[PDB]
Amino acid sequence: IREERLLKVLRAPHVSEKASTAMEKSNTIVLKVAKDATKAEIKAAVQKLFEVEVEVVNTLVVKGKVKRHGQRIGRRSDWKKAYVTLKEGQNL
Amino acid sequence: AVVKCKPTSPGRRHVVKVVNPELHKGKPFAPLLEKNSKSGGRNNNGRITTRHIGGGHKQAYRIVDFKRNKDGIPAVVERLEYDPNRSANIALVLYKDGERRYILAPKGLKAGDQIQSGVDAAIKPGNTLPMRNIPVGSTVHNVEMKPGKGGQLARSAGTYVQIVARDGAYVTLRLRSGEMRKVEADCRATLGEVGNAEHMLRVLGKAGAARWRGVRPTVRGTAMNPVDHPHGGGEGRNFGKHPVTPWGVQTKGKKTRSNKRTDKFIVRRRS
Amino acid sequence: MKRTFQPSVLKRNRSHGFRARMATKNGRQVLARRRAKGRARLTVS
RNA sequence: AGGACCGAACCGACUAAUGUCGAAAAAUUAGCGGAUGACUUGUGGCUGGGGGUGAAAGGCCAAUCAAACCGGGAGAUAGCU
RNA sequence: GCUCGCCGGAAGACCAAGGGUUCCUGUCCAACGUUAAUCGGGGCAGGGUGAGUCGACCCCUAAGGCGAGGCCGAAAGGCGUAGUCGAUGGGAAACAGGUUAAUAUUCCUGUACUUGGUGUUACUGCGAAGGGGGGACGGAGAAGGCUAUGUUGGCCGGGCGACGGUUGUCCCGGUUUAAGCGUGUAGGCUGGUUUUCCAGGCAAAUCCGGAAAAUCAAGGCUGAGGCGUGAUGACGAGGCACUACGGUGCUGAAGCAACAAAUGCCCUGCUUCCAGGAAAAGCCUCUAAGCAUCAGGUAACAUCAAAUCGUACCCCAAACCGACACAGGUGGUCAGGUAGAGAAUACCAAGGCGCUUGAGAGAACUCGGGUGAAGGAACUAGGCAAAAUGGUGCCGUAACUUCGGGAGAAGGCACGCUGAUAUGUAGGUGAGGCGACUUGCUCGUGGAGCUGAAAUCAGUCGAAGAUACCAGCUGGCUGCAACUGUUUAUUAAAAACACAGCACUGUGCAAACACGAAAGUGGACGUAUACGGUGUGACGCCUGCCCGGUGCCGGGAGGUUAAU
Ligand SMILES: [K+]
Ligand SMILES: [K+]
Ligand SMILES: [Mg+2]
Ligand SMILES: [Mg+2]
Ligand SMILES: [Mg+2]
Ligand SMILES: [Mg+2]
Ligand SMILES: [Mg+2]
Ligand SMILES: [Mg+2]
Ligand SMILES: [Mg+2]
Ligand SMILES: [Mg+2]
Ligand SMILES: [Mg+2]
Ligand SMILES: [Mg+2]
Ligand SMILES: [Mg+2]
Ligand SMILES: [Mg+2]
Ligand SMILES: [Mg+2]
Ligand SMILES: [Mg+2]
Ligand SMILES: [Mg+2]
Ligand SMILES: [Mg+2]
Ligand SMILES: [Mg+2]
Ligand SMILES: [Mg+2]
Ligand SMILES: [Mg+2]
Ligand SMILES: [Mg+2]
Ligand SMILES: [Mg+2]
Ligand SMILES: [Mg+2]
Ligand SMILES: [Mg+2]
Ligand SMILES: [Mg+2]
Ligand SMILES: [Mg+2]
Ligand SMILES: [Mg+2]
Ligand SMILES: [Mg+2]
Ligand SMILES: [Mg+2]
Ligand SMILES: [Mg+2]
Ligand SMILES: [Mg+2]
Ligand SMILES: [Mg+2]
Ligand SMILES: [Mg+2]
Ligand SMILES: [Mg+2]
Ligand SMILES: [Mg+2]
Ligand SMILES: [Mg+2]
Ligand SMILES: [Mg+2]
Ligand SMILES: [Mg+2]
Ligand SMILES: [Mg+2]
Ligand SMILES: [Mg+2]
Ligand SMILES: [Mg+2]
Ligand SMILES: [Mg+2]
Ligand SMILES: [Mg+2]
Ligand SMILES: [Mg+2]
Ligand SMILES: [Mg+2]
Ligand SMILES: [Mg+2]
Ligand SMILES: [Mg+2]
Ligand SMILES: [Mg+2]
Ligand SMILES: [Mg+2]
Ligand SMILES: [Mg+2]
Ligand SMILES: [Mg+2]
Ligand SMILES: [Mg+2]
Ligand SMILES: [Mg+2]
Ligand SMILES: [Mg+2]
Ligand SMILES: [Mg+2]
Ligand SMILES: [Mg+2]
Ligand SMILES: [Mg+2]
Ligand SMILES: [Mg+2]
Ligand SMILES: [Mg+2]
Ligand SMILES: [Mg+2]
Ligand SMILES: [Mg+2]
Ligand SMILES: [Mg+2]
Ligand SMILES: [Mg+2]
Ligand SMILES: [Mg+2]
Ligand SMILES: [Mg+2]
Ligand SMILES: [Mg+2]
Ligand SMILES: [Mg+2]
Ligand SMILES: [Mg+2]
Ligand SMILES: [Mg+2]
Ligand SMILES: [Mg+2]
Ligand SMILES: [Mg+2]
Ligand SMILES: [Mg+2]
Ligand SMILES: [Mg+2]
Ligand SMILES: [Mg+2]
Ligand SMILES: [Mg+2]
Ligand SMILES: [Mg+2]
Ligand SMILES: [Mg+2]
Ligand SMILES: [Mg+2]
Ligand SMILES: [Mg+2]
Ligand SMILES: [Mg+2]
Ligand SMILES: [Mg+2]
Ligand SMILES: [Mg+2]
Ligand SMILES: [Mg+2]
Ligand SMILES: [Mg+2]
Ligand SMILES: [Mg+2]
Ligand SMILES: [Mg+2]
Ligand SMILES: [Mg+2]
Ligand SMILES: [Mg+2]
Ligand SMILES: [Mg+2]
Ligand SMILES: [Mg+2]
Ligand SMILES: [Mg+2]
Ligand SMILES: [Mg+2]
Ligand SMILES: [Mg+2]
Ligand SMILES: [Mg+2]
Ligand SMILES: [Mg+2]
Ligand SMILES: [Mg+2]
Ligand SMILES: [Mg+2]
Ligand SMILES: [Mg+2]
Ligand SMILES: [Mg+2]
Ligand SMILES: [Mg+2]
Ligand SMILES: [Mg+2]
Ligand SMILES: [Mg+2]
Ligand SMILES: [Mg+2]
Ligand SMILES: [Mg+2]
Ligand SMILES: [Mg+2]
Ligand SMILES: [Mg+2]
Ligand SMILES: [Mg+2]
Ligand SMILES: [Mg+2]
Ligand SMILES: [Mg+2]
Ligand SMILES: [Mg+2]
Ligand SMILES: [Mg+2]
Ligand SMILES: [Mg+2]
Ligand SMILES: [Mg+2]
Ligand SMILES: [Mg+2]
Ligand SMILES: [Mg+2]
Ligand SMILES: [Mg+2]
Ligand SMILES: [Mg+2]
Ligand SMILES: [Mg+2]
Ligand SMILES: [Mg+2]
Ligand SMILES: [Mg+2]
Ligand SMILES: [Mg+2]
Ligand SMILES: [Mg+2]
Ligand SMILES: [Mg+2]
Ligand SMILES: [Mg+2]
Ligand SMILES: [Mg+2]
Ligand SMILES: [Mg+2]
Ligand SMILES: [Mg+2]
Ligand SMILES: [Mg+2]
Ligand SMILES: [Mg+2]
Ligand SMILES: [Mg+2]
Ligand SMILES: [Mg+2]
Ligand SMILES: [Mg+2]
Ligand SMILES: [Mg+2]
Ligand SMILES: [Mg+2]
Ligand SMILES: [Mg+2]
Ligand SMILES: [Mg+2]
Ligand SMILES: [Mg+2]
Ligand SMILES: [Mg+2]
Ligand SMILES: [Mg+2]
Ligand SMILES: [Mg+2]
Ligand SMILES: [Mg+2]
Ligand SMILES: [Mg+2]
Ligand SMILES: [Mg+2]
Ligand SMILES: [Mg+2]
Ligand SMILES: [Mg+2]
Ligand SMILES: [Mg+2]
Ligand SMILES: [Mg+2]
Ligand SMILES: [Mg+2]
Ligand SMILES: [Mg+2]
Ligand SMILES: [Mg+2]
Ligand SMILES: [Mg+2]
Ligand SMILES: [Mg+2]
Ligand SMILES: [Mg+2]
Ligand SMILES: [Mg+2]
Ligand SMILES: [Mg+2]
Ligand SMILES: [Mg+2]
Ligand SMILES: [Mg+2]
Ligand SMILES: [Mg+2]
Ligand SMILES: [Mg+2]
Ligand SMILES: [Mg+2]
Ligand SMILES: [Mg+2]
Ligand SMILES: [Mg+2]
Ligand SMILES: [Mg+2]
Ligand SMILES: [Mg+2]
Ligand SMILES: [Mg+2]
Ligand SMILES: [Mg+2]
Ligand SMILES: [Mg+2]
Ligand SMILES: [Mg+2]
Ligand SMILES: [Mg+2]
Ligand SMILES: [Mg+2]
Ligand SMILES: [Mg+2]
Ligand SMILES: [Mg+2]
Ligand SMILES: [Mg+2]
Ligand SMILES: [Mg+2]
Ligand SMILES: [Mg+2]
Ligand SMILES: [Mg+2]
Ligand SMILES: [Mg+2]
Ligand SMILES: [Mg+2]
Ligand SMILES: [Mg+2]
Ligand SMILES: [Mg+2]
Ligand SMILES: [Mg+2]
Ligand SMILES: [Mg+2]
Ligand SMILES: [Mg+2]
Ligand SMILES: [Mg+2]
Ligand SMILES: [Mg+2]
Ligand SMILES: [Mg+2]
Ligand SMILES: [Mg+2]
Ligand SMILES: [Mg+2]
Ligand SMILES: [Mg+2]
Ligand SMILES: [Mg+2]
Ligand SMILES: [Mg+2]
Ligand SMILES: [Mg+2]
Ligand SMILES: [Mg+2]
Ligand SMILES: [Mg+2]
Ligand SMILES: [Mg+2]
Ligand SMILES: [Mg+2]
Ligand SMILES: [Mg+2]
Ligand SMILES: [Mg+2]
Ligand SMILES: [Mg+2]
Ligand SMILES: [Mg+2]
Ligand SMILES: [Mg+2]
Ligand SMILES: [Mg+2]
Ligand SMILES: [Mg+2]
Ligand SMILES: [Mg+2]
Ligand SMILES: [Mg+2]
Ligand SMILES: [Mg+2]
Ligand SMILES: [Mg+2]
Ligand SMILES: [Mg+2]
Ligand SMILES: [Mg+2]
Ligand SMILES: [Mg+2]
Ligand SMILES: [Mg+2]
Ligand SMILES: [Mg+2]
Ligand SMILES: [Mg+2]
Ligand SMILES: [Mg+2]
Ligand SMILES: [Mg+2]
Ligand SMILES: [Mg+2]
Ligand SMILES: [Mg+2]
Ligand SMILES: [Mg+2]
Ligand SMILES: [Mg+2]
Ligand SMILES: [Mg+2]
Ligand SMILES: [Mg+2]
Ligand SMILES: [Mg+2]
Ligand SMILES: [Mg+2]
Ligand SMILES: [Mg+2]
Ligand SMILES: [Mg+2]
Ligand SMILES: [Mg+2]
Ligand SMILES: [Mg+2]
Ligand SMILES: [Mg+2]
Ligand SMILES: [Mg+2]
Ligand SMILES: [Mg+2]
Ligand SMILES: [Mg+2]
Ligand SMILES: [Mg+2]
Ligand SMILES: [Mg+2]
Ligand SMILES: [Mg+2]
Ligand SMILES: [Mg+2]
């Protein structure tokens, strides 16, 4: 089911307080996914690469902040995060 | 019928209503009415071509049958209805086989009366016939100018054509204008007079009553400035100009008839 | 006390947008001008 | 029932004072007119320059209107300063 | 932190539009902030937007846009058919409480629900580009039942009071609970079948329509709310355990009744009127072309599936539109208390703020106010401006009138508090109780509380009782315009425009006329009781004479007369 491409979906694990509090208490992992990357694709990718039982994936698009420095305006890239909830068989 | 209204408010002082008690007090028959959007006078190019029209009450089109073909089938008049699209009232005719259709309500017609249409039939008010079968010197309405068409002449409240003569293939008709027009004998005409003749005695009574009939205010040329209308300007109520339209053509006695394709059919012009 | 610019992004795009300009012979020439001049914002979009 | 009455919202703009390098390129304050109607307002459409639209004032058409705005003819022409 | 102040139909709380990170945290004070700044919507980093149900998307369409062929146009292009787009409208489903420094109908917990796909069983006559039904529609009005909500008891937990009194009718605070799934009610709408049948619904149809003949006193439909249950659940005044002084896990009392009550809801109802009130899919239904151990439907079940984009924040504002952190402008929603007719006004609750230069002084003069001797419009172009009047009930009210008006004409008088009539009444809502009908969310029947005017009679305080805020000045003669309305955005609101009504006049429908090289639209899916133009301007009494001039209409002999 969508071999080779699944590898390109997950970019990195996200590091924050809200990310951390959702590790132990909610049993989820927050992670930066590709701008495409549907909830099925993120789930199927976590199911293979991280190899854990996924309950459900929630997803959102974060808007890049307009950082004006020196004398030029420049906006960051829009990146998509995914809160991935895990089943009781969990680890990382 | 013509009831004058009591003067409890100014603009309710001069009101004179045409109350018809025999009309219907309920919603109309849905299958024979489609929607009818308003132009506001404007056309394809979105430009006011006819002035003084705009607004008024939203009003749906009744699919009224003027041609009145469906032959040899007697039809009972179920109920007389209001038509907002029209001067004359309409009648919901139930054909014996189980159609319903709207027709213009003639003078002597009521909820219960039976009507037939076609070639044979009987000579009675409501019954459509070819004008060849109709007697000379008889009052008709809803008259066709061409055989097979709907019905052009005499459809306004109280209106009727009288058949003057019959020269072979042609029938000479005396119209309500006074014009004596020659039409084809194969053309059809519904017998009698068009109902709601009290319509003319209605008097509105307020500016508002014209607005909710979809009319907008007419501004007089004399009021305007030279740039707008030929009558225009002057330092306090001047004129000194021969009456004219906003486009310079003379009004007030000036024949604009110039068809020339139908001049053969007109026997005597109106007067 | 109510000024002239009363914004609406639908109206904006329907009136002045890229497809609104592309639609017409003269609207295509506007774009041809802005390209010829070399503008960054070709339309409002 | 009513282009009925009184009166808030809402729509307006009759009087006065203030303000006039303003708080504001038209407002504030205190009064004032309409307030179920020819009412009012949101959203979207249509009508284009000698053209539109106008319950008509030459009013309105992006703070611009007895002919909009932008680019072009164009360095119009000026017996004038 | 504690006082003080101001808003509270907002200066509160949610949204749309529009902004576009302003949100939140740490940090910094050059500039930006009309002052300072440790602060900030400022600089600099880092966080923060979680959806099958909310919105968009999608499904249908309105005005309207585009528009294969097409028709038309020097070219450009115009119009328009089939179509296809186009919301501001129609179309499946989620609620309570808990949680983050910042999202929550999205996370969590607890209960639900919808539409699809896909397998098994038991049945069985299914299927559109078609038919029919439905969706599905106006203004006003009036009532009845409800609820949101509020008030007061009841119960529960505290409280006995900085200066006189306060264990009592005393004081404070709480008294909350959803969608769903049941029950089908207050009510609203209707005839319900059975078989036959027929030129209609362009074909077909058992459906719709029409016509029959019988058959029983009604059977459906719709429907707020209440009761249920969800809920031994959550929440809950507080405590207990503890403090980075933040709290946090644990426990967690009562958790009822009455009465009042919407502009909400029943109600897309009902009566009622004339100006006569979208469309199309979803949805149910019916069959043609088709297809017959097929394919489809149907239920009951199991299982998957519900993608994508928006979700922070401000939003009558310092974040939008106004060049400004601008005394402006900006759509919807929510609507607590006392007084009140009230969304007016006053004071307040929840919640929110004190308007980003202060500090002194207390001149003239200016601005916004208050009071004013005697006088009282003498002011001035003009009573401009201020002063006045102002509520409710009852009495009383002129000319003139179109018989409605004028009219709130004018002018009067009565109002507070406290007892009594009645230890709070006319009423209002009416509990347990008594019988009875069928089977109930019953009827009468009685009234327990509860709520509650308005009078009258007597007392009684003040200068004054509509005591504040709130809230008509009145009358007389008269010009113009009948009237409500409209108008010079920003020096003119008027006697100007419009207006109903009136007349003239054109127009026989391929109408006149209008926009347009044209095609074509509008007029009008109208047809002379209609339409366009022009003048006049309700209504009443009237509207006199002139056709030489100019126009127009008709007439056609003669004269004159182009192209050819
Ligand atoms: K030149
Ligand atoms: K306080
Ligand atoms: Mg989830
Ligand atoms: Mg999402
Ligand atoms: Mg970038
Ligand atoms: Mg067009
Ligand atoms: Mg059109
Ligand atoms: Mg056009
Ligand atoms: Mg007209
Ligand atoms: Mg209009
Ligand atoms: Mg019509
Ligand atoms: Mg009409
Ligand atoms: Mg008509
Ligand atoms: Mg022949
Ligand atoms: Mg006219
Ligand atoms: Mg007129
Ligand atoms: Mg005129
Ligand atoms: Mg003028
Ligand atoms: Mg013009
Ligand atoms: Mg002229
Ligand atoms: Mg003049
Ligand atoms: Mg004169
Ligand atoms: Mg003269
Ligand atoms: Mg002339
Ligand atoms: Mg001329
Ligand atoms: Mg002329
Ligand atoms: Mg004549
Ligand atoms: Mg536009
Ligand atoms: Mg060119
Ligand atoms: Mg350019
Ligand atoms: Mg741009
Ligand atoms: Mg009315
Ligand atoms: Mg009124
Ligand atoms: Mg009055
Ligand atoms: Mg008044
Ligand atoms: Mg407003
Ligand atoms: Mg004003
Ligand atoms: Mg104004
Ligand atoms: Mg004055
Ligand atoms: Mg003043
Ligand atoms: Mg000055
Ligand atoms: Mg100043
Ligand atoms: Mg004011
Ligand atoms: Mg006043
Ligand atoms: Mg007033
Ligand atoms: Mg008035
Ligand atoms: Mg407006
Ligand atoms: Mg608009
Ligand atoms: Mg347009
Ligand atoms: Mg021009
Ligand atoms: Mg030009
Ligand atoms: Mg032109
Ligand atoms: Mg023109
Ligand atoms: Mg106007
Ligand atoms: Mg002038
Ligand atoms: Mg202007
Ligand atoms: Mg001007
Ligand atoms: Mg010019
Ligand atoms: Mg010019
Ligand atoms: Mg312009
Ligand atoms: Mg040159
Ligand atoms: Mg020059
Ligand atoms: Mg206040
Ligand atoms: Mg209040
Ligand atoms: Mg909201
Ligand atoms: Mg901005
Ligand atoms: Mg953005
Ligand atoms: Mg920033
Ligand atoms: Mg902040
Ligand atoms: Mg610092
Ligand atoms: Mg410093
Ligand atoms: Mg620096
Ligand atoms: Mg500073
Ligand atoms: Mg400054
Ligand atoms: Mg900070
Ligand atoms: Mg900041
Ligand atoms: Mg979704
Ligand atoms: Mg909902
Ligand atoms: Mg949209
Ligand atoms: Mg999709
Ligand atoms: Mg579809
Ligand atoms: Mg569509
Ligand atoms: Mg259309
Ligand atoms: Mg279309
Ligand atoms: Mg087109
Ligand atoms: Mg082809
Ligand atoms: Mg072709
Ligand atoms: Mg073509
Ligand atoms: Mg043709
Ligand atoms: Mg075109
Ligand atoms: Mg079409
Ligand atoms: Mg919408
Ligand atoms: Mg829906
Ligand atoms: Mg919707
Ligand atoms: Mg829903
Ligand atoms: Mg909640
Ligand atoms: Mg909980
Ligand atoms: Mg808890
Ligand atoms: Mg927040
Ligand atoms: Mg759950
Ligand atoms: Mg469970
Ligand atoms: Mg359960
Ligand atoms: Mg269940
Ligand atoms: Mg449901
Ligand atoms: Mg289901
Ligand atoms: Mg259908
Ligand atoms: Mg609707
Ligand atoms: Mg209605
Ligand atoms: Mg009324
Ligand atoms: Mg009544
Ligand atoms: Mg009621
Ligand atoms: Mg309740
Ligand atoms: Mg509640
Ligand atoms: Mg109590
Ligand atoms: Mg104690
Ligand atoms: Mg004490
Ligand atoms: Mg003591
Ligand atoms: Mg004691
Ligand atoms: Mg208490
Ligand atoms: Mg209490
Ligand atoms: Mg239910
Ligand atoms: Mg169920
Ligand atoms: Mg149900
Ligand atoms: Mg039942
Ligand atoms: Mg048939
Ligand atoms: Mg049948
Ligand atoms: Mg039933
Ligand atoms: Mg049912
Ligand atoms: Mg229920
Ligand atoms: Mg109840
Ligand atoms: Mg209960
Ligand atoms: Mg309940
Ligand atoms: Mg229970
Ligand atoms: Mg239980
Ligand atoms: Mg608990
Ligand atoms: Mg605390
Ligand atoms: Mg009650
Ligand atoms: Mg209330
Ligand atoms: Mg209905
Ligand atoms: Mg269904
Ligand atoms: Mg079925
Ligand atoms: Mg799953
Ligand atoms: Mg799923
Ligand atoms: Mg939010
Ligand atoms: Mg806020
Ligand atoms: Mg705020
Ligand atoms: Mg707000
Ligand atoms: Mg404001
Ligand atoms: Mg606010
Ligand atoms: Mg400005
Ligand atoms: Mg600004
Ligand atoms: Mg400020
Ligand atoms: Mg502001
Ligand atoms: Mg304001
Ligand atoms: Mg009072
Ligand atoms: Mg207030
Ligand atoms: Mg300040
Ligand atoms: Mg001083
Ligand atoms: Mg002073
Ligand atoms: Mg003053
Ligand atoms: Mg002073
Ligand atoms: Mg005073
Ligand atoms: Mg004074
Ligand atoms: Mg004095
Ligand atoms: Mg004194
Ligand atoms: Mg005195
Ligand atoms: Mg005096
Ligand atoms: Mg004097
Ligand atoms: Mg003097
Ligand atoms: Mg004088
Ligand atoms: Mg004077
Ligand atoms: Mg005076
Ligand atoms: Mg005055
Ligand atoms: Mg004074
Ligand atoms: Mg005084
Ligand atoms: Mg005063
Ligand atoms: Mg006085
Ligand atoms: Mg006084
Ligand atoms: Mg007084
Ligand atoms: Mg009085
Ligand atoms: Mg008198
Ligand atoms: Mg008089
Ligand atoms: Mg009085
Ligand atoms: Mg009276
Ligand atoms: Mg007194
Ligand atoms: Mg008393
Ligand atoms: Mg008693
Ligand atoms: Mg006693
Ligand atoms: Mg007593
Ligand atoms: Mg009592
Ligand atoms: Mg008493
Ligand atoms: Mg009692
Ligand atoms: Mg008693
Ligand atoms: Mg009694
Ligand atoms: Mg009683
Ligand atoms: Mg009752
Ligand atoms: Mg009962
Ligand atoms: Mg008793
Ligand atoms: Mg009393
Ligand atoms: Mg006494
Ligand atoms: Mg006394
Ligand atoms: Mg006394
Ligand atoms: Mg008073
Ligand atoms: Mg007044
Ligand atoms: Mg008088
Ligand atoms: Mg005079
Ligand atoms: Mg007037
Ligand atoms: Mg007059
Ligand atoms: Mg206007
Ligand atoms: Mg206006
Ligand atoms: Mg105005
Ligand atoms: Mg002005
Ligand atoms: Mg304007
Ligand atoms: Mg101007
Ligand atoms: Mg003015
Ligand atoms: Mg003025
Ligand atoms: Mg005025
Ligand atoms: Mg005047
Ligand atoms: Mg006028
Ligand atoms: Mg006459
Ligand atoms: Mg006449
Ligand atoms: Mg032409
Ligand atoms: Mg033509
Ligand atoms: Mg039409
Ligand atoms: Mg006049
Ligand atoms: Mg007389
Ligand atoms: Mg005369
Ligand atoms: Mg003559
Ligand atoms: Mg003569
Ligand atoms: Mg002449
Ligand atoms: Mg002539
Ligand atoms: Mg002649
Ligand atoms: Mg001749
Ligand atoms: Mg001759
Ligand atoms: Mg000759
Ligand atoms: Mg010759």
d(CA B56, CA B12): 19
Q: CA-CA-CA-CA torsion for C31, C35, C38, C41, nearest 10 degrees?
A: 40
Give residues 169-228 of chain B lying near strand E (Cβ < 7 A).
Answer: 175-177, 179, 181, 196-200, 202-210, 212-213, 215, 217-223
> Ligand 74: distance of its center to the CA of A18 in Å?
43
How many other CB atoms are found less than 10 A from the CB of residue B2?
A: 13
d(CA B117, CA C37): 76
Q: Tell me, in Å, how far CA of A33 is from C1' of E116?
A: 29
CA distances from C13 to B42, C8, C20 (A): 27, 9, 7
Question: Does any strand D atom come closer than 7 Å to the Cβ of C14?
Answer: yes
Span B195-271: which CATH code?
4.10.950.10
From its phi and psi, is residue A19 left (phi > 0), alpha (psi between -120 and 50) or beta? Answer: alpha
Residue pair A55/A29 in contact (Cβ under 8 Å)? The answer is no
- Say what the resolution is, in angstroms: 3.0
Q: Which amino acid is at B70?
A: K
Q: Up-side HSE of residue A53: CA atoms within 13 Å toward CB?
A: 4
* Residues with Cβ within 8 Å of residue B190, at least 6 apart in sequence: B68, B103, B104, B106, B126, B127, B128, B140, B141, B142, B143, B151
Query: Please, which positions of strand E sit below 7 A from a protein CB?
Result: 17-21, 23, 43-45, 47-52, 62-66, 76-77, 79-80, 87, 100-102, 106-108, 132-137, 198-201, 209-210, 272-280, 305-311, 320-322, 328-330, 402-404, 482-484, 496-501, 504-516, 519-539, 550-554
Bridge partner list, A74? none
**Phi, psi (deg, nearest 5) at residue B196:** 60, 45
How many other CB atoms are found less than 10 A from the CB of residue A31?
A: 22
Domain range summary for chain B, segments of one domain joined by +: 1-113, 117-194, 195-271
d(CA B223, CA B231): 8
For the four alpha carbons of B75, B79, B80 and B81, in that order, the dihedral sign comes to negative
> Ligand 20: distance of its center to the CA of B74 in Å?
61
> Ligand 157: distance of its center to the CA of C6 in Å?
29
Widest distance between CA atoms in chain C: 40
d(CA C25, CA C20): 11
d(CA B223, CA B238): 10
Question: Does any strand E atom come closer than 7 Å to the Cβ of B162?
Answer: no
Among the CATH numbers 1.10.275.10, 2.40.50.140, 1.10.357.10, 3.50.50.60, which is that of B1-113? 2.40.50.140
Q: Which residue has the tokens 């990718």?
A: A45
Q: Which amino acid is at B271?
A: S
Element (H, E) at B59: none
Question: Does any strand D atom come closer than 7 Å to the Cβ of B216?
Answer: yes
How open is the CA angle B42-B46-B50, to the nearest 5 degrees? 25
Q: Which amino acid is at B73?
A: I
Output the six-digit token pair for C15. Answer: 């009136």
